[PDB]
Subunit: 388 residues, 4 copies
């Protein structure tokens, strides 16, 4: 209708998304490896704006300097050939067995130091490629057992690491900012900074908090049964939504990484409504895995579907908010009053206001319906294109 | 052996715990109401240190001033008769139908103002009774549907409310501090500030953050599938564990409020280990419900079991930490190294250290086992009293 | 468009749905009680086909015979006035404190006998009102602790109870059949027969299995994180879908009882697709609760929304299945081949078929993509009305 | 004390347990491959009774006949050298990419036929090695999307497959029986036969149901939030507990496969209590993964811990059941009455018994406490070795 993405829509994809070969813990690869150059070309043809990478997605672990230079050269040529951007990069601190107990919070100090050096090397590369955001997903930070990890000590180590990275970027005069990606579990039994809230709270204890925000992922918050739009709202309220990862998840299970729109469809609607109403200006990044049932045609169909679903939901959310009948229902439900200060008159005036206590008619207020069901059915009708 | 509590152990109980009449949404009351005086006497006989209350537990909603005075007088006499303390109090902003859409974040502004006045009245009472901590559980703050609640606006209202309460306590010269209690859901479909992390993050945006901490509850974090000891560790790391609620929960379901030790027993062990190792000095408060299957004899047995289980776990955790074989296993697993700074030498030294990158033997480090399973089996053996 | 229900659509509602007064465990009632006569009239005006009841919804517990007769007379007049039917009835074996440890599986034998007599009395009433199905939801059958309930003994008692009920209906020559409603938890910590599968398995051990089927509820299976359409498919496969309860649930939490279509919208789509493709001919019954935020206008809006959402989804699922492009995608994904016997040639022929083992080209088969993502995006486009 | 296993305890392990190399979806191997001969020797030294295998654990996929013969010969020599048994075997119908959409319920018919031939070949081997039980875990049977898999058709295919296998074993005169292993999800978004109940129900529709039972796994049922002891009780009630897999899981997340005793410790206690009270005579099989943090010393420690924890729990459960104070508490809680028939007098006598209805004192019965909390605290005290 026809919901066709173009680079102006700012849709981005990780190399590791469309490039996922399909290995799962009970299963071998179902697809051959993709050359990053091919991924860049195919994503551009679909209307993507850019790509993102872990160090080890772009440059095989253990590469020589000559190999590294050539991998980067080929990638840059593909970006130049297509007009694709690289808005974000990140470090792989989870695949190699050296990181089995963590990177920044490994019990082994030598591993912690190595993790920092590996990250710093890739920050330099990210800046060279034009990235504005550097993500950190501490997927190995955590434990399967209680004695293995003293979390206060681990948080001290995690703060030290992020503070050193902030010192580094400041010393180099780089404009790049960090986005910490929470996840509750998987691959560790419990992961440190398990939700958006825990990550937001941790950032406030860093030496230079302004350099750090969050990179929430739809499926990660949903793995804790949380409301992803609500958590995004809190991140926006805090001024900390530096990046976002979009995908689908069906509740509380392993991280499915379904295409965006799959999983909890209504949550996807309310997320798009929020991002668009708030004027979020960052990339709409997809961190998803085309299911291992698919061949490459299915990989590109799944990637296209991520963007299509965002655009359909954008249309429906805008129509919802613009509909005079919805605007009336929002007033009927007192969403306008929610946005007004409780006591701009000040504390003493509130204390002196008999209408707030002695003369408050509690039963009359209690009897007033909220009209939320009518409002929500208008929302459903807009999502489904069942208005009239 | 025999794990007998005394007031020196600082165990406290809400009036609403042992006083729960057994109504659930599919069920009528199974027990008669308890007079608070009787609860104070019976808890003291069990070795409790004190009790806590919502306003409406102590003074029936809608009471006259003469009725209020008499309810408080009788309660104070029972406290004096027994030596019981009142370390914490809180407001009921959830039972009355006026609070069906919230107290502090109700869409209706008049309800928000009333909620604040109801709280302020009870802060005065709490201070009169000697409470150090004032808990706020915003159980009605949230939504069942996406359009009903704009979370950025609701967080603005929530901040306004807590800021006004901080202004109030400061204006009165009170020493009392606030503890915000997160919960992910129930009774609302999703509750605002759903976890310890979200609450910690929110506090940092208040005008006087030093006045506010968290009151985490075992079962609430477990309703999001989170690791309660880990979340307590983050609260301790932040200096924000102002109070704690102890109970049991079996995973992801309705809030069960089982007695402490029930539900996730190993998590209970690691929690006690953490509180005791950290020297937490606040009350060990039980927010639990004796199951509705029980008569009053079972109510008091369940309350006694809360304290007994804490004391057993305290003994076992202390024995674990003191055992030279465990101390050796902790070193074998590099818990000592986790507690050492990563780079006290500083950023430039780390950047110049070839042992951290070019000359780091990644394969040798990767080959070193963590020895976590042996450590955890020593922990299991200590918990079960199966050492030798 | 405009998705208007009429009695021919066979939509039914429990009296306890629209009549829910809004009490939750942390909250008092937000709505006055509804007279069943009023509910019948209001539901008929919305286009409902009928209503269902627990004994105690229609006749207050403890009523005299004269009171009982009058309650039933008034209800029958309302049914006659409106043309509403009563296709299903059930017993309340959960609200009264006598049932705190169960009805049919109470540890107390006298309670088990009473539960059976209470049920039998209401079976007679159900038959008088024309009900074809008698539901049993054993919400109190289960435990909070391991020693409280020996499940083998409880299953013996549960079988005895259902066998006695089958003997009763057979002895009276009644045509009514039973539908057992599974639920995993709430109000008990764990409920016996927690899923559709457990209930199906139990039925096979009854003396007269043909008299018993299941009454699955959307939200109950989703409280165990299960796929409700899949479970319905297994019940249909077994010939045991005797009734169904439709509502919404957001994953793993307390039973929300949201209106149908809310909660997991895509699961609602696939459910409707399955019921309609299978030709399920039973009532489309809504077991839901208008949120306690609502006044009566919101109650009726929420009930109307249940039916509206079913009808929208019915339209979209039919359009999906009828679309030649979808029919082609289904063949591309080998749904046709799934429906063909694996080895109609028989075991010996399979054993002798070299194409099934020695000469099977495993790599060629593995390379063939399933094309499931394209199929699922066609399904999404149909659900959202985004085709063209 | 010291909880030392010996072969008489009938503890068994899969080759794939201790042999797990540590690959997870975000991580490469952390341990070298183990020769099955070495695993047999090391497990025997720990006091194991036997081992189990998938075809592809023992014989690399794609092996020639000469290679196959030699792999089996070496394995048999190790079994003979140690006295280890092989009580169970199974087929790998999940790792190879050909099985990406299933084995027995693959949409591709040629894959379904191949899956059956692969299984049949391994049934022959299992019988040669003396296995009594043949497990089937359909880990790839299921879907990520609704259109991909018609579950009624898939259940038809699954029944055909199991019926053909039953025809095969009967035709060969083998004594081996099948055990179907349910799992709710992972690696598929939803797996067919997701719980013990669904598997039990499916078996009743097979042509020769007596040949089939279940192989429940602790962590699988817990991935649906279900009570594993309750599900085992239902399997025992049905006469269908043909095998069992023991491990640990912390609730609703990816399948952790922790050592037995880890995860939900109290559920482990009640499971052991049930198996021992019921006289279950099958192997106590561990399907677990030593965490990838561990070296080989940690692998063997984790395996030893599985057995140790079973033996500790066995001791504590026996002591609980034998304690006269517990026996009294069980009577106080009416567990004796739960085990008595409800109405051995028959239906007519129940209908004629005024004590069951008109003269039943509902309030007196309701007032009687169940005494479950005292019983459960005795259970806790026994588990923790805190009696006296
Ligand atoms: Mn993910
Ligand atoms: Mn991500
Ligand atoms: Mn709670
Ligand atoms: Mn609490
Ligand atoms: Mn329900
Ligand atoms: Mn229902
Ligand atoms: Mn498993
Ligand atoms: Mn298994």
């Amino acid at each position: 209708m026809n919901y066709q993405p173009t680079p102006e829509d700012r849709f981005t994809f990780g190399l590791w998304t469309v490039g996922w070969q399909g290995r799962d813990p009970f299963g071998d690869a179902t697809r051959r490896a993709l050359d990053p150059v091919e991924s860049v070309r195919r994503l551009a043809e679909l209307g993507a704006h850019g790509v993102t990478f872990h160090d080890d997605d772009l440059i095989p672990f253990g590469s020589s300097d000559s190999e590294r230079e050539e991998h980067v050269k080929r990638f840059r040529q593909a970006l130049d050939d297509t007009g694709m951007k690289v808005p974000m990069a990140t470090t792989n601190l989870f695949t190699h067995p050296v990181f089995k107990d963590g990177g920044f919070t490994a019990n082994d100090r030598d591993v912690r130091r190595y993790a920092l050096r590996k990250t710093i090397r890739n920050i330099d590369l990210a800046v060279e490629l034009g990235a504005e955001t550097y993500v950190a997903w501490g997927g190995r930070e955590g434990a399967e057992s209680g004695g293995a990890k003293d979390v206060r000590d681990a948080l001290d180590r995690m703060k030290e690491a992020f503070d050193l990275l902030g010192e580094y970027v400041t010393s180099q005069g780089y404009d790049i900012r960090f986005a910490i990606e929470p996840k509750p579990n998987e691959p560790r039994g419990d992961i440190l900074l398990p939700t958006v809230g825990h990550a937001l709270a941790f950032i406030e204890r860093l030496e230079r908090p302004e350099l750090y925000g969050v990179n929430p992922e739809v499926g990660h918050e949903q793995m804790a049964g949380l409301n992803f739009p609500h958590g995004i709202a809190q991140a926006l309220w805090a001024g900390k939504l530096f990046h976002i990862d979009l995908n689908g998840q069906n509740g509380i299970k392993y991280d499915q990484d379904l295409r965006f729109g799959a999983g909890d469809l209504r949550a996807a609607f309310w997320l798009v409504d929020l991002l668009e109403s708030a004027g979020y200006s960052g990339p709409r990044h997809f961190d998803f895995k085309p299911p291992r049932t698919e061949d490459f045609d299915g990989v590109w169909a799944s990637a296209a579907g991520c963007m299509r679903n965002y655009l359909i939901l954008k249309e429906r959310a805008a129509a919802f908010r613009a509909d005079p009948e919805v605007q009336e229902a929002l007033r009927a439900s007192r969403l306008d009053e929610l946005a007004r200060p409780t006591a701009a008159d000040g504390l003493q005036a509130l204390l002196d206001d008999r209408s707030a206590f002695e003369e408050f008619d509690v039963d009359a207020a209690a009897a007033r319906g909220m009209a939320f069901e009518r409002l929500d059915q208008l929302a459903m009708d807009h999502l489904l294109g069942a208005r009239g």
